[PDB]
């Protein structure tokens, strides 16, 4: 009854799950797409054909085919992001958590996972939607989408591998929510899409894309924005990487049809094993198969759309973490280690700069170095380490997001900006990594409310505060409850540019988030590189 | 007898002058070259022909012909730099202060005035050598040299106006000191040349020039160095400016001989009246007629000479002041005023940046702006004013000097670096201008020892400290006295790069003077401009 829901494509049977001292309904693994397998690899998604009988939605679905991180075998800090279910190309499913008893027509939040567009799963423990749905009385959906070559191989002009199909997977899931969430007690007119990293870039890409705009009400972007340097490629570069993928597999490269035909005959792991080989440069924070600026999903360049106001005008809430870059340095840059303080020599700093800004000429590398080097103390290994951490985070996350924030706010209907800088008491990563990319997610999803995870009481309060900001924003377009006597999170405005710190201390309001470095990344360095 | 000295070109009679309750000998206005007048305008100097009888050396000579600053009529802060004697092209003279009684063979210090190579006088009150000569028992010489077009009009390939003749004037006075200072009790083997701004650049240029190197022992450079961006031009640019000077005066421009003949017919003020018109850019801290890189006084580019060690290897003492730029902004940049705090709007900041780095493209100007702008607080008029002050001082004085310091120290025999950051208690310029270009000179010359000038007792002690550093360095190559228990001024070395603050507080040693901004000015911005 409560668990048996008839959708437009057939009946589904959810499950009653415990949450804290109560219970909630979960509908796990609902298909929203035809399985993109066989001759439909690389193709746009097709709607899921109606089924007879009752879909058993009591268990999580398969995860999409992806690179699996084996750098630290058995280590929870890295394993927590790996697929926890079987990988399969048959992976286009979504999950729903519904308060019990079922609400009449409540706010909906739709989670879009990140993972550099090459990885990610809806089923991670850290994305368990039951705490947020229960605590804030929202209907919480997590979608899935094809990643890597399966989702973003781009041979522009081909209709068999057009590019951006992972973004179309997300859109088809949003269309499914639009058409079906009313049957689960959700209001399809009050859908907030939120996501982190590539998920936050994705959220911003749906804000830009005309074909997505009417499928949600407002948006939350965590540590990602659509203009991030890693988040898209040109049609020429997407084609070059697709052709190089075929070259790495001894494919016929004479035509798109023959290349695509060759690639469709490979096992999924064969593509994944050579995926990283197509990158143009040795780099960190760069990924092989990402959205393409195609003239269709994106009618024109992202910058021209931002400048002209060609995007959905609504409310957004968005922000960044203090140390976005540290995870990427640990994995890709010389001198960094999980098991040491990672003091960086001058020589390893220069190597990291080159890896961090791979597209830059020597003049640009000199500019980055001068901007982030204390020449009174240039052999200070801690300063070199933290400077490289800042370079990676500023270039790849913070300054792109600040560019987006400032462009969006000129036309939008309300911007709320945060700076998350709380290091969790129970972090398994070393202290030098600081406030890591993605480590606000466990607060957004309410993991500190679980006693067994051993967060502090102040971290539980911070989680409840963040969940309530997010859900109140989703419900109203404003994270603040007016008439309350809590500290108010102010609107980000073009003039005053206010943001808040998110941490366990009383709220602080600041202005012009990392303005000095972002003038460098957003105005001066592009001019230098263009010259 | 003590005042009656026979030199190689004739007898000179000095005068006994009072100094701080005592007396000293002064020989004022001794000629060291033939008057460079008439057909000798623009020509290399010629040695003074011997004279019969006794040259009256009791009064200061004429000053060389120059632009006179009338921005603030009657204001001592500007008038103290203007000529205080009649101007004449007949101006190649030197002055000598000799301790009394005359020493046997003591250290010589030869002052070379600054003034952007367009102005300056040996006779200014602030260059009065009697306090330094008396207090430190040195023979103090101040030379003179042609400035402006008269000293630096350059038509390379012409022997009638070859360029650099003002530098050759300085060299001829150094040659005169070499040949004659022994008759005044000075040791020609222990001559220190020192100078400020263009004078400091000049000192550095004699360090570089093979034809000057044997005419002095060691060198002091104050707020100037030979590689300063204002201190030299190429032969093509010198020729362009000389032709444009002729154009401004309706001269025949068909040949060097015709142009030079035209320019020699003009009265001196006619040249001066159009001198500034030949500059290629609206700018501050740029001067029309300056040394030329000619292949003769300078055998190759300054940078190649510095890189190869093709220069005099000796000891140097040098440094800069905290606020080198402020004087030049007051005179040339929008928003600045002697009578206000000169808070600078963002618009006037951007105008000032353009004036301060005239050779920069738009990307270069963006780079400078970004380096000196606090984008958390970009409408702060004090920060904008102080940022422009730093830009002008860093680009034109501090960072060129640090480039020289580092290149010289690789091959030299001892470097001592200072940072003068004391603002005089009786300064007549407003507070925003800070520790102004040239305002260490009064301490070097011992003016705080004169009670009527109303320096504090701490400033008198600072002046005595500085004079003793300067003269002890001149005597020994080391500003520190041996066996003394005062704090030691360390050698500047390539690795440690130590310098001292010069002020009324106990000496503090620091490292890497202005290192962050000078990486920008000395490495990044030149690379950017070269690449774009
Ligand atoms: C794969 N991964 C890792 C770390 C993260 N913080 C992540 C944050 C967001 C996302 Cl989407 C993926 C993340 C830490 C290091 C282990 C790998
Ligand atoms: C396996 N791999 C990875 C990353 C890379 N940048 C790579 C570049 C070249 C090659 Cl061959 C393999 C690469 C980023 C971190 C994820 C793994
Ligand atoms: C081959 N490789 C590379 C990079 C990585 N981060 C990698 C991470 C994991 C693994 Cl398994 C392989 C990796 C950085 C770019 C250089 C190659
Ligand atoms: C002409 N002049 C002036 C000021 C200075 N500090 C100077 C320092 C050195 C030299 Cl050479 C010339 C100087 C202050 C402003 C008045 C003009
Ligand atoms: C009198 N004058 C002029 C110009 C200048 N750049 C000057 C720079 C500094 C000083 Cl002190 C005086 C200057 C150009 C235009 C002609 C007049
Ligand atoms: C920079 N500047 C100055 C003075 C002038 N008379 C000028 C006349 C024209 C032009 Cl373009 C620039 C000028 C007087 C001395 C202060 C600087
Ligand atoms: C294993 C597999 O899927 N093979 C098919 C192949 O039979 C077909 O001819 C080709 C056309 O695109 O598409 C491939 O996907
Ligand atoms: C649905 O799947 C769950 C998990 O395996 C199982 O417990 C339940 O009995 C299934 N429902 C059916 C078969 O009707
Ligand atoms: C949002 O739009 C409404 C309706 O036009 C307007 O009244 C309101 O001022 C806007 N708010 C912001 C923050 O732009
Ligand atoms: C949480 O802390 C308690 C003691 O404070 C400890 O016994 C327990 O093992 C911790 N939990 C985990 C998962 O380690
Ligand atoms: C030298 O000149 C001064 C003033 O010009 C004069 O008083 C003095 O008598 C002169 N000496 C002579 C003429 O021997
Ligand atoms: C100066 O030269 C002497 C003699 O060659 C040498 O012994 C001494 O080390 C040098 N001093 C410096 C500071 O270079
Ligand atoms: C110096 O101080 C004395 C004593 O007060 C005063 O008479 C004199 O006018 C001052 N000098 C100047 C130039 O102000
Ligand atoms: Cl709080
Ligand atoms: Cl004449
Ligand atoms: Cl050394």
Q: How was this structure determined?
A: X-ray
Give Cα A395 to chain centroid, integer Å. 16
What number of other Cβ atoms are within 10 A of residue B506's Cβ? 8
C-beta of residue A58 within 8 angstroms of C-beta of residue A45: no
Buried/exposed code over A319-356 (b: 16+ C-beta within 10 A; e: otherwise): bbbbbbbbbbbbebbebbebeeebbbeeebbbbbbbbb
Q: At what angle do helices B235-248 and B256-265 cross, to 10 degrees?
A: 50
Q: What share of chain B is helix, strand, coil (3-state, %, to 5)?
A: 40, 15, 45
For Cα atoms A326, A329, A331, give the angle at the middle one, nearest 5 degrees.
115
Residue B363 to residue A528, Cβ atoms within 8 A? yes
CATH number of B1-532: 3.40.50.1820
For residues B341 and B432, give the distance between their C-alpha atoms in angstroms, rounded to a whole number: 6
Contact A216, A126 (CB under 8 A): no
Of B366, B376, B532, nearest to A515 by CB-CB distance is B376
Q: Are strands A218-222 and A415-420 parallel, antiparallel or unpaired?
A: unpaired
| Paired residues of B473 in beta bridges | none
d(CA A340, CA A430): 8
Residue carrying structure tokens 């080391």: B478
Establish whether residue A371 lines the binding site of ligand 8, counting it when its CB lies within 6 angstroms of any ligand atom. Answer: no
Q: For residue B501, what are its two tokens?
A: 């603050």
Q: How far is CA A370 from the centre of its chain?
A: 31
How many Å apart are CA B201 and CA B221, to the nearest integer? 7
CA distance B285 to B201: 14
Q: Whose CA is nearest to atom 8 of ligand 2?
A: A276
**Helix pair angle (B381-393, B346-356), 10° resolution:** 0
Question: b/e map of B359-371 (b: 16 or more CB within 10 Å)?
Answer: ebeebbebbbbbb
Written as one string, the DSSP assignment of B277-292 is: GG-SSS-SS--SS--B
Q: Which residue in A has a C-alpha nearest to residue B517's C-alpha? A: A375
User: A376–B511: do the CB atoms touch at under 8 Å?
Assistant: yes
Give CA–CA dist A248/A270, Å, rounded. Answer: 10
| A129-140 b/e (C-beta count within 10 Å ≥ 16 → b) | bbbbbbbbebbb
Rounded Cα distance between A71 and A81, Å, is 12
Q: Is B211 exposed, middle or buried (0-12, 13-18, 19+ CB in 10 A)?
A: middle
Identify the three-state secondary structure at position A24. strand
In B477-520, alpha helices (H):
515-519
Contact A363 B531 (CB under 8 A): yes
Q: How far apart are CA A430 and CA A423, in angstroms?
A: 11
Burial of A104 (0-12, 13-18, 19+ CB in 10 A): exposed
**Contact by Cβ (8 Å): A18, A75:** no
CA dist B162 → B33, B166, B174, B313 (Å): 18, 11, 20, 28
Contact A503, A421 (CB under 8 A): yes
Asked whether A56 lines ligand 8 (CB < 6 A), one says yes
User: What would the two tokens of residue B258 be?
Assistant: 């015709």
| Of residues A311, A159, A302, A153, the one with CA closest to residue A235 | A153
Q: How many CA atoms lie within 13 A of A416 on its CB side?
A: 24
Distances (CA, A) of A469 to A188, A465, A472, A473, A502: 20, 6, 5, 6, 11
Residue appearing with tokens 């894309």: A209
Strand partners, B54: B11
For residue A424, count other CB atoms closer than 10 A to its CB.
20
Whose CA is closest to B138, among B166, B108, B168? B108
The answer to whether B12 and B54 have CB atoms below 8 angstroms apart is yes
Q: What is the distance of C-alpha B104 from the center of its chain?
A: 30
Helix ranges, B194-267 (H): 198-208, 235-248, 256-265
Cross-sheet strand order for the sheet of A498-502: A15-19, A22-31, A93-98, A139-142, A106-112, A186-196, A218-222, A316-321, A415-420, A498-502, A509-511
Residues in B closer than 8 angstroms to A363, CB to CB, are 527-528, 531-532
Asked if B127 contacts B441 with a C-beta cutoff of 8 angstroms, the reply is: yes
Distance CA B35, CA B29 (A): 13
* Coil/strand/helix, residue A45: coil
The reply to whether omega before A101 is within 30° of 0 (cis) is: yes
CATH for A1-531, options being 2.40.50.140, 3.30.200.20, 3.40.50.1820, 3.40.1190.20: 3.40.50.1820
Which parts of A248-380 fold into alpha helices (H)? 256-264, 268-274, 302-308, 326-332, 346-356, 362-372
Contact B515 A366 (CB under 8 A): no
Beta bridge partners of A110: A141, A193
Contact in structure between B524 and B367 (CB atoms under 8 Å): yes
Atom of ligand 3 lying closest to residue A332 CA: 6
A chain contacts of residue B516, beta-carbon cutoff 8 Å:
374-376
Say how far apart CA A452 and CA A449 lie, in whole Å. 9
Tokens 């031009």 sit on residue: B233
Q: What is the separation of C-alpha B230 from the centre of its chain, rounded to a whole number of angstroms?
A: 12
H/E element, A188: strand A186-196
Separation CA B128–CA A332 (nearest Å):
66
Q: Gap positions in chain B, given as the residue before each gap (C–N > 2.5 A)?
A: none
State the Cα–Cα distance between residues A504 and B503, nearest whole angstrom.
Answer: 48
Check pocket membership of B276 for ligand 5, CB cut-off 6 A.
yes
List, in sequence order, every residue forming a beta bridge with B13; answer none if it has no partner: B4, B56
CA of A276 to the centre of ligand 2 (A): 5
Domains of chain B, residue spans: 1-532
CB atoms within 10 A of CB B221: 29
> How many beta carbons lie within 10 A of that of residue B503, not counting itself?
18
- In angstroms, what is the span from residue A332 Cα to ligand 3's centroid? 6
Residue with tokens 């879909």: A55
Paired sense of beta strands A186-196 and A106-112, if any: parallel
Cross-chain CB nearest to A370 (options B376, B512, B519)? B519
Residue B444's alpha-carbon distances to A165, B23, B197, B287, B464, in angstroms, are 77, 20, 14, 26, 8
CA dist., res. B363 & res. B385, Å (int) = 22
C-alpha A493 – ligand 9 centre gap (Å): 12
Q: Do A366 and B532 touch (CB under 8 A)?
A: no
- The rounded distance, in Å, linking the Cα atoms of B314 and B409 is 10
CA dihedral B438, B439, B444, B447 (to 10 degrees): 130
User: What value does the CA radius of gyration of chain B take, rounded to a whole number of Å?
Assistant: 22
Please check whether residue B382 is in contact with residue B342, taking contact to mean a CB–CB distance below 8 angstroms. no
**Alpha-carbon gap, residue A318 to A323, rounded angstroms:** 16
What b/e string do you get for B50-74 counting C-beta neighbours within 10 Å, with b at 16 or more? eeeeebebbebbbbbbbbebeeeee
Q: What is the rounded distance in angstroms from the CA atom of residue A96 to the CA atom of residue A114?
A: 18
Atom of ligand 8 nearest to the CA of A56: 1
**How many Å apart are CA B91 and CA A357, to the nearest integer?**
61
Contact between A225 and A323 (Cβ < 8 Å): no
The ligand that comes nearest to the alpha carbon of residue B397 is 4
How many angstroms away from the CA of A367 is the closest CA of chain B?
7
Give the minimum alpha-carbon distance from A81 to chain B in angstroms, rounded to a whole number: 37
Neighbour count for residue B129 (Cβ, 10 Å): 24
Nearest to A517 by CA among B368, B373, B386: B373
CB B455 within 8 A of CB B463: yes
Strand, coil or helix: B318: strand
């Amino acid at each position: 009854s409560e668990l048996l829901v008839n959708t437009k494509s057939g009946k589904v049977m959810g499950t009653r799950v415990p949450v804290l001292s109560s219970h909630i309904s979960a509908f796990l693994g609902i298909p929203f797409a035809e399985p993109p397998v066989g001759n439909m690899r690389f193709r746009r998604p097709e709607p899921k054909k109606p089924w007879s009988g009752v879909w058993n939605a009591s268990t999580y679905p398969n995860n999409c085919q992806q690179y699996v991180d084996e750098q630290f075998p058995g280590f929870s800090g890295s394993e927590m992001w790996n697929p926890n279910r079987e990988m399969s190309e048959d992976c286009l499913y979504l999950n729903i958590w519904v308060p019990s008893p079922r609400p009449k027509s409540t706010t909906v939040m739709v989670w879009i996972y990140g993972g550099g567009f090459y990885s990610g799963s809806s089923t991670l423990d850290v994305y368990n939607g039951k705490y947020l749905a229960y605590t804030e009385e929202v209907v919480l959906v997590s979608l899935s989408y094809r990643v890597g070559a399966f989702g973003f191989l781009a041979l522009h002009g081909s209709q068999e591998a057009p590019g951006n199909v992972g973004l179309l997977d997300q859109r088809m899931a949003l269309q499914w929510v639009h058409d079906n969430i009313q049957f689960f007690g959700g209001d399809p007119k009050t859908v907030t899409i939120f996501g982190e990293s590539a998920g936050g870039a994705s959220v911003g890409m749906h804000i830009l894309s005309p074909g997505s705009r009417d499928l949600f009400r407002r948006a939350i972007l965590q540590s990602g924005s659509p203009n991030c340097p890693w988040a898209s490629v040109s049609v020429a570069e997407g084609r070059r990487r697709a052709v190089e993928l075929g070259r790495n597999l001894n494919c016929n490269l004479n035509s798109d049809e023959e290349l695509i035909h060759c690639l469709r005959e490979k096992k999924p792991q064969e593509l994944i094993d050579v995926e990283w080989n197509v990158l143009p440069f040795d780099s960190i924070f760069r990924f092989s198969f990402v959205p393409v600026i195609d003239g269709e999903f994106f009618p024109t360049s992202l910058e021209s759309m931002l400048n002209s106001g060609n995007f959905k005008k609504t409310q957004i809430l968005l922000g960044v973490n203090k140390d976005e870059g540290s995870f990427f340095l640990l994995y890709g840059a010389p001198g960094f280690s999980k098991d040491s303080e990672s003091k960086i020599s001058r020589e390893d700093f220069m190597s990291g700069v080159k890896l961090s800004v791979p597209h830059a000429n020597d003049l640009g590398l000199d500019a980055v170095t001068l901007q982030y080097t204390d020449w009174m103390d240039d052999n200070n290994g801690i300063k070199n380490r933290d400077g490289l951490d800042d370079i990676v985070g500023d270039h790849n996350v913070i300054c792109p997001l600040m560019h987006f924030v400032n462009k969006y706010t000129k036309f939008g209907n309300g911007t709320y900006l945060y700076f998350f800088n709380h290091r969790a008491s129970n972090l398994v990563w070393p202290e030098w990594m600081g406030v890591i990319h993605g480590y606000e997610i466990e607060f957004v999803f309410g993991l500190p409310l679980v006693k067994e995870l051993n967060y502090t009481a102040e971290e539980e309060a911070l989680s409840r505060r963040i969940m309530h900001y997010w859900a109140t924003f989703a419900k109203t377009g404003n994270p603040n409850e007016p008439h309350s006597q809590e500290s108010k999170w102010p609107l980000f405005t073009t003039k005053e540019q206010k943001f808040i710190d998110l941490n366990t201390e009383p709220m602080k309001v600041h202005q012009r988030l990392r303005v000095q470095m972002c003038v460098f990344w957003n105005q001066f360095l592009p001019k230098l590189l263009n010259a």
